[model samples]
Target: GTSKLKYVLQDARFFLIKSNNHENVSLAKAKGVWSTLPVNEKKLNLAFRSARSVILIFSVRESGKFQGFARLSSESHHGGSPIHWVLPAGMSAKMLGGVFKIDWICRRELPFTKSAHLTNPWNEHKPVKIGRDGQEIELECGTQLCLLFPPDESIDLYQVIHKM
Candidate 1:
């Protein structure tokens, strides 16, 4: 159930990213795995599309169910351990969200609350219908999730307890 995601941006601090929680990561300035792909979509192949490149997708769960992640801006990072980094030249939140309609990236569950379950989220698949407030994303479930951030240069995070 992995979909294809593309990358073509680079910045880092001003790269802009989204998350399931309201960690206000930009205010903290931390480093961790980030993803713009929905809990139901995939972007591995598109990310690996190139002559020479490498990408990293941290799908830690407990399996595929977690609260959030730190922000090192891997969507378009260049150079480093190379093993736990991103690929595709560049994949920032602005591109992911704008192009693919993703929610957040580098989500962190702080002193508040937030928000998926899907394997091979970076593989390749078709698509589905995603709703808001008690609607399943592309899987068999129901939840409410949404965010509002400009195009770039701002980390939009939403940390709220869910009530069925």
Candidate 2:
């Protein structure tokens, strides 16, 4: 069933593959590599980068639709713009730590509606908080969390995460 949802939840598996720029994208490898990141860094990036606070079906390969969702974390610096990091799928919890900024949910279908929140592990701060002074806030780490959406699409366009 093409689950009709109020907001489009992105597939984290697709986000990882697109972000990694893999043609014959492998879910297992994507999962493995994403799990290797600092935390749910994947989702953090997506939410911050996507034109809409929410995500639509970003990946539709000729072979098949990559499934899953990643939490997004975004921070701004000097009004330059916000940058983000995405996290891995939900099933791979063995890789998760107690501290992370976001919690990305990776699944194999639409209507994926599980949300989570965590703190950043890389931070030495006990509470692990981020402040804003109009300066830049480095992502530091990421986690998979629910993608939020704005009313319009033109607000933000680039969906696929580009590797740096």
Candidate 3:
């Protein structure tokens, strides 16, 4: 009784690798999370779908610092983006339009990994591969979902929101 909603690429941002290209990195000088948060705050709600029926899959830096995230919204769903923060399992909030204040956090100093659920069906049985160049990564969902992180000096993320 549900349909698949694919977020192809609403918007994305990348931070520059720190000078010396090692040991230190800062958020991008322009359009990085900090700079885009204000204008994109409202858009976040619209970008991501209600967690009730969504299984998100995204790319994170190997070191796990904040780079960029899968940006999506609909101005009519969940009123804000759920991808920015962690959400409890089996959330049943209605999909509607509105603005909500989301406290953003910095993940630059944290180490993280990418994961997807097999039961979700949308992301089951897909293989994850980092490009030979090590700059690109791909999440395969039997072609139902297509996400690739380009080989650049920044963090990249991609996911989906389904509409019923």
Candidate 4:
């Protein structure tokens, strides 16, 4: 069986970006392997759409399980390593929870108080009723993840965590 994990959003600090009008990230700010995407306008546009919020799905290649990820007001960081980090493959470790695209991007912070396995996560091509306390997002299996900050400057990340 694959490992599972749960994490909570703890405080994270980030540097500010300078934009004259709408919140626009300079192409140079994207980090890691995702940097290649910043220069692509369409992709950057999509990343911007999710800057304030993120949801990601990842299927484990080694095992047949998958995990979902969701994040809110993650400060849309750039130019540095993740403030927190999520283990890429859920094949080993302490069965923490599942790793999804969005979780990989923002980095794992605190531990999740509750978690469980989806008897047949859809990533395996099985059909089952999927439900959630929040929302669900779909993504390809085993892909790297990243982040986008909100365009609005006044949003406080402190208040955002309560939504989870």
Per-residue C-alpha lDDT of model 2 across residues 101-137, encoded as one tens digit per residue: 2223333432212211323343343221221111111
After superposing all C-alphas onto the true structure, candidate 1 shows an RMSD in angstroms of 14.9
Model 4 ranges with Cα > 4 A deviation: 1-52, 72-77, 82-164
Worst 10 residues of 1 by lDDT: 1-10
lDDT value, candidate 3, whole model: 0.26
Q: CA shift at 74, candidate 2, in angstroms?
A: 3.6
lDDT of 4 by residue, 54-89 (tens): 433222222222222233233233444432323333
Candidate order (lDDT): 2, 3, 4, 1
lDDT of each: 0.25, 0.28, 0.26, 0.26
| Residue pairs with backbone atoms closer than 3 Å in model 4 (clashes) | 4-95, 4-96, 4-97, 5-96, 5-97, 6-112, 51-148, 76-149, 84-107
Candidate 4 lands at a TM-score of 0.26
Candidate 3: which stretches are off by over 4 Å? 1-5, 10-29, 32-66, 70-112, 116-129, 132-164
The number of the candidate with the highest lDDT is: 2
The TM-score obtained by model 1 is 0.22
lDDT of 1 by residue, 1-164 (tens): 00111121121111112333333222223433333444322342233333122212122212222333222222333243322223234544433341221233434332212232222111232121122211122212111121211122334323111100
Q: Which residue pairs show backbone clashes in model 3?
A: 5-162, 44-81, 45-80, 45-81, 46-73, 46-74, 47-72, 47-73, 48-72, 135-151
* RMSD score of candidate 4 (Å): 16.0
Worst 10 residues of 2 by lDDT: 128-137
